[PDB]
Amino acid sequence: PGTPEVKVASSEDVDLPCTAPWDPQVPYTVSWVKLLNERPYSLKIRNTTSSNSGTYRCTLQDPDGQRNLSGKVILRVTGS
Amino acid sequence: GTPEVKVASSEDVDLPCTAPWDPQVPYTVSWVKLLERPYSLKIRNTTSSNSGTYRCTLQDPDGQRNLSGKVILRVTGSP
């Protein structure tokens, strides 16, 4: 393991936290994938269902120069 | 420049890597969703939730290089 986890009840909205250890005062762009709110860079998922459960990865790109930062998070949807 | 697939719900689909890869190079493959043929992604019994944009990533065995391409899936039906 070592990957933090979010649990949410089915049909609820969720704001998925980006877990990349990012630098303050850097203006990242964000990408989100699935591996097969005042928190920056979170991914909003509305009306969650069971099929949404799985592992997600956010990646932050510096606008200047070729550098990025990635972190993972687990989602578990619990209800029918 | 990115291709799209339409499929009837509950039908299977094999999602193609669209990376312009070299024949005879032995890549390993990863697949993500953006929120026998080598390197394809298998998806059985499609439903509407499967619709979206997908990305294959082929890794060169040397580890220093990879090549990716994206593809869209649209699941359709009547009810």
Side-chain angles (χ1 to χ4, degrees), chain A residues 43-69:
Chain A
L43 174 73
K44 174 136 45 174
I45 303 177
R46 302 188 174 276
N47 206 320
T48 49
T49 76
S50 187
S51 60
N52 293 134
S53 306
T55 298
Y56 294 73
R57 183 185 73 83
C58 64
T59 299
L60 299 174
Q61 183 68 51
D62 193 313
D64 306 2
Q66 325 190 45
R67 283 169 294 104
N68 64 64
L69 268 61

mmCIF file of all heavy atoms in Angstrom, chain A residues 43-69:
data_model
loop_
_atom_site.group_PDB
_atom_site.id
_atom_site.type_symbol
_atom_site.label_atom_id
_atom_site.label_comp_id
_atom_site.label_asym_id
_atom_site.label_seq_id
_atom_site.Cartn_x
_atom_site.Cartn_y
_atom_site.Cartn_z
ATOM 1 N N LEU A 43 -9.719 16.948 -8.076
ATOM 2 C CA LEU A 43 -10.604 16.558 -9.161
ATOM 3 C C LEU A 43 -12.022 16.335 -8.647
ATOM 4 O O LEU A 43 -12.232 15.487 -7.780
ATOM 5 C CB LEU A 43 -10.083 15.304 -9.852
ATOM 6 C CG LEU A 43 -11.022 14.741 -10.907
ATOM 7 C CD1 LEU A 43 -10.979 15.654 -12.114
ATOM 8 C CD2 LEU A 43 -10.611 13.337 -11.283
ATOM 9 N N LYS A 44 -12.995 17.074 -9.164
ATOM 10 C CA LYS A 44 -14.372 16.894 -8.704
ATOM 11 C C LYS A 44 -15.046 15.756 -9.466
ATOM 12 O O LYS A 44 -15.037 15.731 -10.692
ATOM 13 C CB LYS A 44 -15.190 18.181 -8.800
ATOM 14 C CG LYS A 44 -16.661 17.957 -8.456
ATOM 15 C CD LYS A 44 -17.213 19.048 -7.536
ATOM 16 C CE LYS A 44 -16.813 20.447 -7.977
ATOM 17 N NZ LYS A 44 -17.480 21.496 -7.153
ATOM 18 N N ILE A 45 -15.636 14.826 -8.723
ATOM 19 C CA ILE A 45 -16.432 13.746 -9.300
ATOM 20 C C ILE A 45 -17.828 13.775 -8.699
ATOM 21 O O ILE A 45 -18.013 13.543 -7.506
ATOM 22 C CB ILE A 45 -15.817 12.370 -9.043
ATOM 23 C CG1 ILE A 45 -14.396 12.304 -9.594
ATOM 24 C CG2 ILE A 45 -16.688 11.284 -9.651
ATOM 25 C CD1 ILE A 45 -13.716 10.989 -9.316
ATOM 26 N N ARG A 46 -18.810 14.052 -9.549
ATOM 27 C CA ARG A 46 -20.185 14.213 -9.108
ATOM 28 C C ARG A 46 -20.987 12.926 -9.176
ATOM 29 O O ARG A 46 -20.744 12.071 -10.031
ATOM 30 C CB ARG A 46 -20.862 15.278 -9.972
ATOM 31 C CG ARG A 46 -20.174 16.631 -9.930
ATOM 32 C CD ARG A 46 -20.989 17.694 -10.629
ATOM 33 N NE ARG A 46 -20.399 19.019 -10.477
ATOM 34 C CZ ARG A 46 -20.598 19.800 -9.421
ATOM 35 N NH1 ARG A 46 -21.377 19.383 -8.430
ATOM 36 N NH2 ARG A 46 -20.026 20.997 -9.355
ATOM 37 N N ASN A 47 -21.937 12.810 -8.250
ATOM 38 C CA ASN A 47 -22.874 11.698 -8.187
ATOM 39 C C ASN A 47 -22.155 10.358 -8.310
ATOM 40 O O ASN A 47 -22.437 9.565 -9.206
ATOM 41 C CB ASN A 47 -23.929 11.859 -9.286
ATOM 42 C CG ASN A 47 -25.243 11.179 -8.949
ATOM 43 O OD1 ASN A 47 -25.267 10.080 -8.394
ATOM 44 N ND2 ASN A 47 -26.350 11.840 -9.282
ATOM 45 N N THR A 48 -21.211 10.130 -7.404
ATOM 46 C CA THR A 48 -20.370 8.939 -7.432
ATOM 47 C C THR A 48 -21.161 7.643 -7.475
ATOM 48 O O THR A 48 -22.237 7.535 -6.890
ATOM 49 C CB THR A 48 -19.423 8.902 -6.227
ATOM 50 O OG1 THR A 48 -20.175 9.147 -5.033
ATOM 51 C CG2 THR A 48 -18.358 9.984 -6.365
ATOM 52 N N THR A 49 -20.608 6.664 -8.182
ATOM 53 C CA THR A 49 -21.154 5.316 -8.218
ATOM 54 C C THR A 49 -20.056 4.287 -7.998
ATOM 55 O O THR A 49 -18.874 4.629 -7.978
ATOM 56 C CB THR A 49 -21.839 5.015 -9.560
ATOM 57 O OG1 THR A 49 -20.840 4.787 -10.561
ATOM 58 C CG2 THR A 49 -22.733 6.173 -9.993
ATOM 59 N N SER A 50 -20.454 3.030 -7.821
ATOM 60 C CA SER A 50 -19.526 1.948 -7.510
ATOM 61 C C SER A 50 -18.424 1.791 -8.555
ATOM 62 O O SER A 50 -17.304 1.411 -8.233
ATOM 63 C CB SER A 50 -20.278 0.630 -7.372
ATOM 64 O OG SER A 50 -19.413 -0.388 -6.910
ATOM 65 N N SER A 51 -18.754 2.063 -9.811
ATOM 66 C CA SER A 51 -17.795 1.892 -10.895
ATOM 67 C C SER A 51 -16.623 2.870 -10.799
ATOM 68 O O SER A 51 -15.558 2.629 -11.370
ATOM 69 C CB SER A 51 -18.487 2.053 -12.248
ATOM 70 O OG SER A 51 -19.070 3.335 -12.375
ATOM 71 N N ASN A 52 -16.823 3.965 -10.069
ATOM 72 C CA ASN A 52 -15.779 4.971 -9.864
ATOM 73 C C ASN A 52 -14.612 4.544 -8.979
ATOM 74 O O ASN A 52 -13.539 5.141 -9.045
ATOM 75 C CB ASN A 52 -16.386 6.246 -9.267
ATOM 76 C CG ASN A 52 -17.308 6.963 -10.227
ATOM 77 O OD1 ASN A 52 -18.407 7.382 -9.858
ATOM 78 N ND2 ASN A 52 -16.857 7.127 -11.464
ATOM 79 N N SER A 53 -14.806 3.508 -8.173
ATOM 80 C CA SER A 53 -13.731 3.016 -7.317
ATOM 81 C C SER A 53 -12.510 2.606 -8.128
ATOM 82 O O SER A 53 -12.628 2.059 -9.222
ATOM 83 C CB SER A 53 -14.212 1.850 -6.452
ATOM 84 O OG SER A 53 -15.374 2.209 -5.722
ATOM 85 N N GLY A 54 -11.337 2.909 -7.582
ATOM 86 C CA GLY A 54 -10.074 2.602 -8.225
ATOM 87 C C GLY A 54 -8.977 3.560 -7.799
ATOM 88 O O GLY A 54 -9.150 4.349 -6.870
ATOM 89 N N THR A 55 -7.847 3.499 -8.493
ATOM 90 C CA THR A 55 -6.688 4.322 -8.163
ATOM 91 C C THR A 55 -6.471 5.473 -9.138
ATOM 92 O O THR A 55 -6.545 5.284 -10.349
ATOM 93 C CB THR A 55 -5.425 3.464 -8.110
ATOM 94 O OG1 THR A 55 -5.577 2.481 -7.082
ATOM 95 C CG2 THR A 55 -4.214 4.318 -7.808
ATOM 96 N N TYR A 56 -6.254 6.676 -8.609
ATOM 97 C CA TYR A 56 -6.095 7.842 -9.467
ATOM 98 C C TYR A 56 -4.727 8.502 -9.282
ATOM 99 O O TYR A 56 -4.099 8.356 -8.234
ATOM 100 C CB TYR A 56 -7.185 8.856 -9.143
ATOM 101 C CG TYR A 56 -8.577 8.395 -9.485
ATOM 102 C CD1 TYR A 56 -9.213 7.430 -8.712
ATOM 103 C CD2 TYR A 56 -9.271 8.940 -10.551
ATOM 104 C CE1 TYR A 56 -10.491 7.006 -9.007
ATOM 105 C CE2 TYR A 56 -10.553 8.524 -10.852
ATOM 106 C CZ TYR A 56 -11.156 7.558 -10.079
ATOM 107 O OH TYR A 56 -12.432 7.146 -10.382
ATOM 108 N N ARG A 57 -4.259 9.195 -10.319
ATOM 109 C CA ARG A 57 -2.966 9.886 -10.294
ATOM 110 C C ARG A 57 -3.056 11.329 -10.818
ATOM 111 O O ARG A 57 -3.478 11.539 -11.955
ATOM 112 C CB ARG A 57 -1.943 9.065 -11.084
ATOM 113 C CG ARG A 57 -0.522 9.595 -11.106
ATOM 114 C CD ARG A 57 0.329 8.740 -12.042
ATOM 115 N NE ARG A 57 0.011 8.975 -13.447
ATOM 116 C CZ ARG A 57 0.506 9.968 -14.177
ATOM 117 N NH1 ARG A 57 1.351 10.833 -13.635
ATOM 118 N NH2 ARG A 57 0.150 10.094 -15.451
ATOM 119 N N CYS A 58 -2.659 12.324 -10.023
ATOM 120 C CA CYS A 58 -2.598 13.688 -10.552
ATOM 121 C C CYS A 58 -1.170 13.998 -10.973
ATOM 122 O O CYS A 58 -0.228 13.550 -10.325
ATOM 123 C CB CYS A 58 -3.087 14.721 -9.537
ATOM 124 S SG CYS A 58 -2.107 14.855 -8.042
ATOM 125 N N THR A 59 -1.007 14.767 -12.046
ATOM 126 C CA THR A 59 0.315 15.234 -12.457
ATOM 127 C C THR A 59 0.372 16.735 -12.712
ATOM 128 O O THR A 59 -0.367 17.266 -13.540
ATOM 129 C CB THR A 59 0.797 14.493 -13.693
ATOM 130 O OG1 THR A 59 0.887 13.097 -13.387
ATOM 131 C CG2 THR A 59 2.170 14.997 -14.094
ATOM 132 N N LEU A 60 1.252 17.409 -11.980
ATOM 133 C CA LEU A 60 1.454 18.845 -12.130
ATOM 134 C C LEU A 60 2.660 19.220 -13.014
ATOM 135 O O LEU A 60 3.786 18.814 -12.741
ATOM 136 C CB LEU A 60 1.627 19.436 -10.737
ATOM 137 C CG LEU A 60 0.388 19.223 -9.869
ATOM 138 C CD1 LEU A 60 0.633 19.675 -8.444
ATOM 139 C CD2 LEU A 60 -0.802 19.928 -10.468
ATOM 140 N N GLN A 61 2.411 20.007 -14.061
ATOM 141 C CA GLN A 61 3.440 20.477 -15.003
ATOM 142 C C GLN A 61 3.935 21.906 -14.819
ATOM 143 O O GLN A 61 3.122 22.825 -14.875
ATOM 144 C CB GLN A 61 2.915 20.356 -16.434
ATOM 145 C CG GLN A 61 3.929 20.738 -17.495
ATOM 146 C CD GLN A 61 5.077 19.767 -17.583
ATOM 147 O OE1 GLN A 61 4.877 18.558 -17.687
ATOM 148 N NE2 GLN A 61 6.296 20.292 -17.538
ATOM 149 N N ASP A 62 5.235 22.121 -14.605
ATOM 150 C CA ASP A 62 5.686 23.508 -14.571
ATOM 151 C C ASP A 62 5.567 24.111 -15.967
ATOM 152 O O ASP A 62 5.981 23.490 -16.949
ATOM 153 C CB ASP A 62 7.142 23.574 -14.096
ATOM 154 C CG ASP A 62 7.587 24.982 -13.726
ATOM 155 O OD1 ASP A 62 7.327 25.923 -14.504
ATOM 156 O OD2 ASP A 62 8.226 25.148 -12.662
ATOM 157 N N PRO A 63 5.039 25.341 -16.053
ATOM 158 C CA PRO A 63 4.863 26.050 -17.324
ATOM 159 C C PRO A 63 6.157 26.335 -18.056
ATOM 160 O O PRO A 63 6.208 26.390 -19.286
ATOM 161 C CB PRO A 63 4.206 27.362 -16.905
ATOM 162 C CG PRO A 63 3.513 27.053 -15.662
ATOM 163 C CD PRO A 63 4.300 25.988 -14.959
ATOM 164 N N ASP A 64 7.214 26.467 -17.265
ATOM 165 C CA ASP A 64 8.539 26.776 -17.774
ATOM 166 C C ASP A 64 9.483 25.626 -17.528
ATOM 167 O O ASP A 64 9.781 25.281 -16.385
ATOM 168 C CB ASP A 64 9.081 28.052 -17.114
ATOM 169 C CG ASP A 64 8.130 29.245 -17.243
ATOM 170 O OD1 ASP A 64 7.028 29.092 -17.807
ATOM 171 O OD2 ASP A 64 8.485 30.345 -16.766
ATOM 172 N N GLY A 65 9.968 25.040 -18.609
ATOM 173 C CA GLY A 65 10.937 23.981 -18.495
ATOM 174 C C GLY A 65 10.218 22.664 -18.335
ATOM 175 O O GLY A 65 9.009 22.614 -18.083
ATOM 176 N N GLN A 66 10.971 21.589 -18.500
ATOM 177 C CA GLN A 66 10.389 20.268 -18.565
ATOM 178 C C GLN A 66 10.441 19.485 -17.246
ATOM 179 O O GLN A 66 11.317 18.646 -17.046
ATOM 180 C CB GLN A 66 11.071 19.483 -19.683
ATOM 181 C CG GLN A 66 11.451 20.342 -20.888
ATOM 182 C CD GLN A 66 11.904 19.524 -22.083
ATOM 183 O OE1 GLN A 66 11.284 18.521 -22.441
ATOM 184 N NE2 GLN A 66 12.993 19.951 -22.709
ATOM 185 N N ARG A 67 9.500 19.767 -16.351
ATOM 186 C CA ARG A 67 9.490 19.186 -15.010
ATOM 187 C C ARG A 67 8.029 18.872 -14.722
ATOM 188 O O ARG A 67 7.155 19.686 -15.018
ATOM 189 C CB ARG A 67 10.110 20.157 -14.003
ATOM 190 C CG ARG A 67 11.632 20.172 -14.086
ATOM 191 C CD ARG A 67 12.305 21.295 -13.307
ATOM 192 N NE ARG A 67 11.988 22.612 -13.856
ATOM 193 C CZ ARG A 67 11.127 23.473 -13.325
ATOM 194 N NH1 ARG A 67 10.478 23.166 -12.210
ATOM 195 N NH2 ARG A 67 10.918 24.647 -13.909
ATOM 196 N N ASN A 68 7.760 17.717 -14.118
ATOM 197 C CA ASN A 68 6.464 17.434 -13.501
ATOM 198 C C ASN A 68 6.467 16.629 -12.204
ATOM 199 O O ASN A 68 7.450 15.969 -11.867
ATOM 200 C CB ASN A 68 5.555 16.730 -14.509
ATOM 201 C CG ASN A 68 6.085 15.391 -14.926
ATOM 202 O OD1 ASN A 68 6.205 14.476 -14.109
ATOM 203 N ND2 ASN A 68 6.416 15.262 -16.200
ATOM 204 N N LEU A 69 5.349 16.696 -11.485
ATOM 205 C CA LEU A 69 5.208 16.079 -10.172
ATOM 206 C C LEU A 69 3.921 15.261 -10.141
ATOM 207 O O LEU A 69 2.860 15.744 -10.529
ATOM 208 C CB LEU A 69 5.166 17.130 -9.063
ATOM 209 C CG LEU A 69 6.461 17.541 -8.371
ATOM 210 C CD1 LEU A 69 7.455 18.155 -9.348
ATOM 211 C CD2 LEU A 69 6.154 18.498 -7.242
#
